[PDB]
Symmetry: C4
Subunit: 221 residues, 4 copies
């Protein structure tokens, strides 16, 4: 029966059918959002969901047979696998994160549809040639975060009282959001030289970003 199913799976109708449900369930997720719609077509949608997830487990099963080991070595199928598994976990139990994470299946539309795979693929290919810099940066944040925690955490618990607190704040300063009016001016009210810690941080972190950008452009060209 292998080739029998292998012809169903490998078929056109099959994919088109799946890609059909994606956009269908996708639209349903947006309506499941409305408190009103839920009072009307409430159940209609709830059932439509259990249906799709079933149809999708069947599909993922068929695909594994038709691909055996190859499947669990294909990034795209792996995703499809993991994304459907989450959707499988009972509506209740544990936290509703999983209940929310289910919407991640709409990402199935990137997998199932070529071109999308193309862009995503092209974007990710760039990541590798950025890890050296990304690593440099994380070391940088780690070092400055530890320094900030012990330089301002005492009098500024909210923004630097912790290593993670400091990580968050330093990240914020990097995006340049409210860094002066929101964090450094207030800080200088107690530590007049805090600017000696942040301006440099801003320069180094900005310079890198600039370079990083350059890299991608020049390397792609």
């Amino acid at each position: 029966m292998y080739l029998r199913i292998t012809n169903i799976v490998e078929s056109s109708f099959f994919t088109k059918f799946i890609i059909y449900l994606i956009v269908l369930n996708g639209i349903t997720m947006g309506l499941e959002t409305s408190k009103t719609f839920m009072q009307s077509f409430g159940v209609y949608t709830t059932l439509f969901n259990q249906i799709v997830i079933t149809i999708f487990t069947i599909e993922i099963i068929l695909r594994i047979y038709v691909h055996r080991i190859s499947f669990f070595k294909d990034p795209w199928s792996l995703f499809d696998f993991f994304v459907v598994a989450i959707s499988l976990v009972p509506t209740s139990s544990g936290f509703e994160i999983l209940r929310v994470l289910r919407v991640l299946r709409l990402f199935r539309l990137v997998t199932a549809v070529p071109q999308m795979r193309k862009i995503v693929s092209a974007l990710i290919s760039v990541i590798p040639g950025m890890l050296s810099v990304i690593a440099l940066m994380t070391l940088f944040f780690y070092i400055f975060a530890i320094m900030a925690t012990q330089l301002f955490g005492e009098r500024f618990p909210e923004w630097f009282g912790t290593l993670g607190e400091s990580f968050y704040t330093l990240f914020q300063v990097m995006t340049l959001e409210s860094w002066s009016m929101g964090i450094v001016r207030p800080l200088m009210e107690v530590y007049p030289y805090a600017w000696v810690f942040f301006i440099p941080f801003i320069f180094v972190v900005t310079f890198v970003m600039i370079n990083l950008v350059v890299a991608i452009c020049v390397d792609a060209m």
Copy 2:
């Protein structure tokens, strides 16, 4: 008479004249702004308005005869058409949106004048080679908008209570405006892990935009 008129439309004086009015109506449009001016040269300008729209419906007609089917296949013509059309809709009735959209006619200066067309044409030519990414992103915003609405809309109605409110807020976060001080810090007051939903979102969204820019730059090369 075809060739008779066709020689008027195709004439220099014709274009130069139309371009003359554009800049004139254009200038008079900025005075129509002054509460004071409107108390003096008020009517002068009002009449001058009906005059220009007249002359312009004339011009648009002639052009259609001299071009027939070709006119309604010319992007620039079409624009000129739809922009003068609006300007035609009666001063009253419905809403004043239309009454405001009239100023869109000053865009005719991009049409009537070469060079401007080159830039607009050059800018737009790039759009098509961005649709794969723009689609990817929209999908992304859609998925995260749904998640956010069901994760923070209960306690944060203003920013996430709705799918559309969430779209707006997520766009704001993308432009990085007030994302930390104004949205995420407050959010973490109730949801300590909210940073796990927004930092990644900021990374993905930022990465893409970076790439997209590379593309505009690389492809032009």
Copy 3:
């Protein structure tokens, strides 16, 4: 005597002497800033100023003789001329703008010193191939500014009650500063669809900027 002076001006000592005073007066301007220093070396500096400006008028005079018409056709000398003229205007009379504008002479250091001329020259060379786009943009702002003045100036006098008010605000939105929390969220409290006017504005204005950037990189390469 021409060649006599033409040998003084054209000399090395001459330039080095001028470039010397620049950095000298430059440092003096930074001290003239201190309320304290002004209570001590107050006059010392005030005289040192009248001296330099004199020495500089002499210099600019010599240069004109040694160059005649060529002078008033050299951008760099013209600047030097205009910048010294302002410094000439009496300390009193009119407004102190001129009194402040005097500090513009420190820009003499860009003129007098090569390399600086080089960079400035290279930066400005780019401007020309940006005017088409810059023009497009100014038209854009003009049109949207007029629209905003008549769409929100009534209920938001501070930010849109005027054509110029609107120009300023729209510029702010372009730099993306407080555009949502600061201007559009508040605006939507009265005009729920204001986002339909600003998001597009943000996209168009951002797209252009992105392109503009690309241009310079690609054209320079």
Copy 4:
């Protein structure tokens, strides 16, 4: 014994060992952050600190013998030298700045590890080809800082009362943070034309930065 030691320093185990401690002291540095941890493994870590700095002064010495004059001519060596030196300065005395600067040792991980050196080296190599612009800009900030101080320092002490306060504020405006809502709008409440000093400043500063980026990108190509 030269070659005897020279074979230890030059050995793999030597480097791997040093790199081992870096990551160890590194990890222990993030725990030294926890108020709690310090109440438990408090001393454990404290002693482990004196141990590492010891081992490191040893390592730095050996290296100097095996390299002599070459050591104090190696940027990376020098860094390792000056970073361990600080870490040597007694826990007490003077200020704890030094006590905090100790964490800078984790930067040794950039030194001791190749690849990291490549990036840092690659990033820095670009700096030199930016000094002409960086000089131009600094001149610019200096001139505008002086002007601003004498134009708004009287009524706006916090942001412009001083040459240095002005430097800080102008830098903030350059990063575009809160420049309108937080600085210029308030300013215009007393000085209606302040927009004539800041928009141009924003244009010049933005233009340059754009170019500077082009340079990093173009030159790498």
